[PDB]
């Protein structure tokens, strides 16, 4: 069933969460995990290890598809990502290349007001 060779591990690392989502070559979702879906709630959800375990939980649950090697597509800042990529090696993949899709607006939309 399908049995894709390669894929793309999208990582949406915000300050509060780290949503890992392994897709195929043509941006088509195969599975996902989150820091909130791993357990780790509140203060624990915003950490490098809670992203690591989320990537370990996203590493499995895509074994049916059988991805050998993939590309990382980190996004946002977050405490994860400099930790989440370590998890993809230790799990069982080969990282072809690492990239950023951090959406830089070229002074476009007025952001929200500063908080106090």
């Amino acid at each position: 069933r399908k049995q894709v060779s390669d894929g793309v591990a999208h990582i949406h690392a915000s300050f509060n969460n780290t949503i890992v989502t392994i897709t195929d070559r043509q941006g088509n979702a195969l599975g996902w995990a989150t820091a909130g879906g791993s357990g780790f709630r509140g203060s624990r959800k915003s950490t490098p290890f809670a992203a690591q375990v989320a990537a370990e939980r996203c590493a499995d649950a895509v074994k049916e598809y059988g991805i050998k090697n993939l590309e990382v597509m980190v996004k946002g800042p977050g405490p994860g990502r400099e930790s989440t990529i370590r998890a993809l090696n230790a799990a069982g993949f080969r990282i072809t290349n690492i990239t950023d899709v951090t959406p830089i607006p070229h002074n476009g939309c007025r952001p929200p007001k500063k908080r106090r």
Partner: protein
């Protein structure tokens, strides 16, 4: 101490089992400075332990103390502002001393008859890990494993 890094006092070996590990166990078991009463209880306990387990005393006490020994314990540190649970690798000197205290603390409760009987039973239950001392390590692990997020 704020910036006064000084070493610790030397201890003495116990006459009948010339060593160090159980010599400190006597000190933790002691109350009101009565070492004569406390040392008689530890010998009575380890002699009743060695009869049942079918081993020596040092090795019977070891295969018991290691089963109630903590690997990682949980402190809490406020670095920035908030208060969360940071686990840390316990030091080898405190490692075995923290275990000895949990054996004695469990033996205060669980009122069988004698202190020599209670320690013997606690150390016997520690050998087949099913006492209250192993439960107190087991919970200490669960905090470190659950709150492993924090470095």
């Amino acid at each position: 101490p704020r910036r006064r890094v000084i070493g610790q006092r030397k201890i003495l070996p116990d006459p009948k089992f010339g060593s160090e590990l159980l010599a400190k166990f006597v000190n933790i078991l002691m109350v009101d400075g009565k070492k004569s009463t406390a040392e008689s209880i530890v010998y009575s306990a380890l002699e009743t332990l060695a009869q049942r387990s079918g081993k020596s005393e040092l090795e019977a006490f070891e295969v018991a103390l290691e089963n109630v020994r903590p690997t990682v314990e949980v402190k809490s540190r406020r670095v920035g502002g908030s208060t969360y649970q940071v686990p840390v690798e316990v030091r080898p000197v405190r490692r075995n001393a923290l275990a000895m205290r949990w054996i004695v603390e469990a033996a205060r409760k669980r009122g069988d008859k004698s202190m020599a009987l209670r320690l013997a039973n606690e150390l016997s239950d520690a050998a087949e890990n099913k006492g209250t001392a192993v439960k107190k390590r087991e919970d200490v692990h669960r905090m470190a494993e659950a709150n492993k997020a924090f470095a």
